[PDB]
Symmetry: C4
Subunit: 387 residues, 4 copies
């Protein structure tokens, strides 16, 4: 039993092979499946698990009513083996939460679950299911975190949290956590930046996060840092805009792109030098479709040219949140950190005429062997009996 090193580089990849699909909503039509949203994947040296925020209710039951709502005392962070439907019969309880993160340092699971009132939320940190720390809202305005896996390097795991307005300047903090205890934090000095729901991963002993600007950027902000939390900040320069909503592709900016900049969706990207693997919706205006784009100079370059595009979900199909997750050499036996990603497929409100909102998931892992584009949509037929 040993700590993840996290000191090797990210595996370069040429394409994405499908890894999992849970068909949660299709199955929940009859089976006992949690109403969920904000799912994410995270692995240990032994297994990969799907984490998710339940709504404390099951699909096709009356208690799924009004589940478009983001926060409540009923939401809980739970997890199950990857690819399985989130059910009360196969799910491990993690924490009470309407915002969350989780990651394995090689020894145990760290989970972070935020609950409580909007004006004084509290993040409860657990290590091996034991409460080890808490951090309370410092701006009294919806303390919130990744909704994807934290990143671990040599026994230290890192996350980002935000507190403050969703439509203006907020406050962003980076945390270093050891055995579930916060050992260091720093507030990012990022005037005119907006960070939410960061997708963070380790790469050569350091952490890179690609996040969501809900205020005024249709491209994605990023923050990178070493174990001592010495950080750098910026925005993805590519004219291949990564957020949703967004403008049509055109000349980009290394700062926040104001056009269609308000609102957004959780997403991710993988940096490789000046290049970037961009995951994004296919629609510029709604959470529909998904695609992976390789842009060889997209991290630092502003043009809208790219080299590779791989279809993941058809433009006429619902998508939603997406996030990175990695597989360490301790798990794979490789000499690099393998990048994977998941996509949330959201069904129900507000776009569909149901009483409920829930999602299923798909995931892919990066490879250098042959791959293919396609569409792996949710596939449920709405409305349900309960609607």
């Amino acid at each position: 039993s040993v700590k993840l090193a996290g000191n090797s580089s990210l595996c370069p990849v040429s394409g994405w092979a499908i890894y999992s699909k849970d068909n949660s909503v299709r199955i929940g039509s009859k089976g006992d499946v949690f109403v969920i949203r904000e799912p994410f994947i995270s692995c240990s040296p032994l297994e990969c698990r799907t984490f998710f925020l339940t709504q404390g209710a099951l699909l096709n039951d009356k208690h799924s009513n009004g589940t478009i709502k983001d926060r409540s005392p009923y939401r809980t962070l739970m997890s199950c083996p990857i690819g399985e439907v989130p059910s009360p019969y196969n799910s491990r309880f993690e924490s009470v939460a309407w915002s969350a993160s989780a990651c394995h340092d090689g020894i145990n699971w760290l989970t972070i679950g935020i609950s409580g009132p909007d004006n004084g939320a509290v993040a409860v940190l657990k290590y091996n299911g034991i409460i080890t720390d808490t951090i309370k809202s410092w701006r009294n305005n919806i303390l919130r975190t990744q909704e994807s896996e934290c990143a671990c390097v040599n026994g230290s795991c890192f996350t980002v949290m935000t507190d403050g307005p969703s439509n203006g300047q907020a406050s962003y903090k980076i945390f270093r956590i050891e055995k579930g205890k916060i050992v260091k934090s720093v507030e990012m000095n990022a005037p005119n930046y907006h960070y939410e729901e960061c997708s963070c991963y380790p790469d050569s002993s350091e952490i890179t996060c690609v996040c969501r600007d809900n205020w005024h950027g249709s491209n994605r902000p990023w923050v990178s840092f070493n174990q001592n939390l010495e950080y750098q900040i910026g925005y993805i320069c590519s004219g291949i805009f990564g957020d949703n909503p967004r403008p049509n592709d055109k000349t980009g900016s290394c700062g926040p792109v104001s056009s269609n900049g308000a609102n957004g969706v959780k997403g991710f990207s993988f940096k490789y030098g000046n290049g970037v693997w961009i995951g994004r919706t296919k629609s510029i205006s709604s959470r529909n479709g998904f695609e992976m784009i390789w842009d060889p100079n997209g991290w630092t370059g502003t043009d809208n040219n790219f080299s590779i595009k791989q279809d993941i979900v058809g433009i006429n199909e619902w998508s939603g949140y997406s996030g990175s997750f990695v597989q360490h050499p301790e798990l794979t036996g490789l000499d690099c950190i393998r990048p994977c990603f998941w996509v949330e497929l959201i069904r129900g409100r507000p776009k569909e005429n149901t009483i409920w909102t829930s999602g299923s998931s798909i995931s892919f892992c990066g490879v250098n062997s042959d791959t293919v584009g396609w569409s792996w949509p949710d596939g449920a037929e709405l409305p349900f009996t309960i609607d």
Copy 2:
């Protein structure tokens, strides 16, 4: 694999961080969830489990009819991982019982399950699921026990049982149990006292129990003892009355407070010198709401002043039973015994127009980092389809 020492002191705490919430009733609207009551939490060196008394039926089924009833041949003690719904598909069978206790000595689980007729009930003791002892009613009047975890110190576990009237003087016995075998017992000499449903915990090699006086006390009786069963008795002196029902807060008594003293509810409190952490309903007349109060001299002082109050369940929401559970250093890695507590959220009869009665649960653990008050209620919408 080693016996719990139980020789360190109780961890002082400034607040309570939320630990679990199962949403059992909300989920049971569709899912296969046991009708239950009298749940409690108990931990081993490895995990924490929710124990509970089923009614041998599932929610939203006709067999849940009449489950306001306390005792029957169908009630069974079962357990599942903390935070999960009590289902036939994830629950371990423990014992046949309509009253129960359980605890882990560091090596194995001890469970105590009382079943049989009101005039001759028998407690069946199990160690690692094997019957190790029995104790039969000695007053022929509803032998009954904790409905929360027993307490273990250096290979010996302790509990309290009551036999006799619920509305007058009864008989109370303390038991010392080793590997599931009763090695010693003593009858408490407590004229004018009434003890039921004790919440007991270890603290510096000795046991402290805070219980329910159903006869004539609106404050809570307590009994403490060493491994030798040499005991002391009294009542919590604070004018912050702990039982339900109870009078409005006023000058208290170190004896039983007669005002609104009849009837009651299972509860708990944590002693710290002259001070006390009091968990109680918010309503003085019904099982509604829940709050934690820190009263620096409430154990021995009679005034109605206090220093800290933390909201747990809103006054307009149903609560019910509550009980202590601890986490030992063998589990946490701390240098003290950590105090936690659970709350039963009762739904159905008699206050609601259903055919059934059942509960869900929430739990919290004590910390010295930042916390927040809120309301984490049951959240089910009654009546159900079966009603």
Copy 3:
């Protein structure tokens, strides 16, 4: 990991403490519970499991139709932890079978499952879930076995099988099995005897079986043997008749009691010298009620006097099959083999107006501490929605 010795004597006991109750039928009203019958319990050095013959269908589903039928290609032997409901979600598959036995030798599980046509049934023997042997019908007339646990001594396990008429002289064979392989068998020379559904247990290195005479005995036949299959045969002499149906208690016989001798029910008894613990229905004419009787000279004496009687199921409640199971010192840490027993509570056809037949179960273990009589019935309300 070591073979059960089985060389200590049976623990003498003064009473029976309740061990488990699954409430299968009550729960199956909504939950996904197998339609079953012929359940039995058996333990390893680590755990105790309920074995049972499914009807390849669930309660309250149309496929439960006609399940009064004894034999079909759909019946399967499965098992789950004791006290849990037999569900597709918690049950281990053992074998395809409409008659069965099983037991643990201390190393692995032996299971015996008989399937195939009435005129050529085949018993499939498995050791650790791997087929190790088969034995085919030798009289071409419904090869059938214990429907309770086989008995193991020093790495050898033993069972009894019957082939031939249910209403006249049949053929009875004893088998010695090692690691799932039949190493020896012998045909019992028992003219005028009838043996079915034996309840066998180990006691001082030898095996004692108490069985069912379906031909012409209202008392129970027995067969005992050593590891070399050298056997003795007889009938329980007590005037406290053990079968169902049976006459009112009166002077008994050490041979088959012809009065009400036809038909019967699976049962058990524990021999202690000239004495016997008798488990039986309360009704002399139907499968209702259950009681344990201690008759100090009932094994060899013909009078109808007895010393102890303990109620188990009320006479106005349904019972059914019953069988012995033991707990070895390797499991309990005792210096003797502890006797326990289970009772099948049959609901549905032919006595009740349903389309189906199924059972739940209760179990008890022998102790020398205080116990109490009561009634722990099935408790389901029939008919069900499907009827």
Copy 4:
């Protein structure tokens, strides 16, 4: 933990003893059971598992509509313990796939799952649930594989894949895989042959596959090879034709039998010198019934005589796919590789008036002790409530 040797010979067997039956469709009438097809069994040194292709839906739910369809983005390869129903609550997720294979090399599970578009499908290979390789369609015409277990010898596992027309000459490749990585492949030079859905097993360090000719053969093609992929090809010569559909038994051919040669069904056979154990439907025109036939010179001889026939499923009952699986000495303790087989029992479309298509399964293992023929059919009553 050690690699399977696979160097012993196949165990000669005289008959087949029933091993498992899951009753999936009967149970799925009420329970939460996946709609599935193309099930198969495969074992490790420790356990045997049922693999299967779900339709991302449950029985008796509207999402089972149209499941006669072979390929979709919703189909997933999952597995559960043998004999258990495939449920979301007991099934492990393996891969996203509408065609698949899997096998254990003694250390870990290899799974192969093909998904993507018909004109560019991709096989994703996993070792211990981690993606280790991919192979993409080379003829752009429905890349497809075994639908039964791959075969492992000394740390190398082997499979066969096909790409191209289902009604004419296609392309067939053999693969050698080590720890989930393709280390060698070769295209079979088989003009006028057609290979699909091979059932492959190890025997004396080499691999033998019996497959399906969908083009123009009513007998079955075979391919055998050593670890070096040096292969031999041919057709089973016996006049006891093995495919479905097929002509009435008559003089056979060692080449493809054109009569009723178009179309077919997945099947298997076990070679013993010039002899062959043939598993086949009972009907020559439809997927009904199943039987095992021993033909002492059927591998190389063209006559229609045989020595042994054992009934498995009645001619008036539905069958479907069938495939071999083996149990290695590492699992059984035998000095040979034991032959077993499974049968898919298909219910629904196109032969039955339902909206759905799904299957249950039975399995048998070869023995030299006594066995019996019978019929162990699916047993579900169609249509269902959803139809």
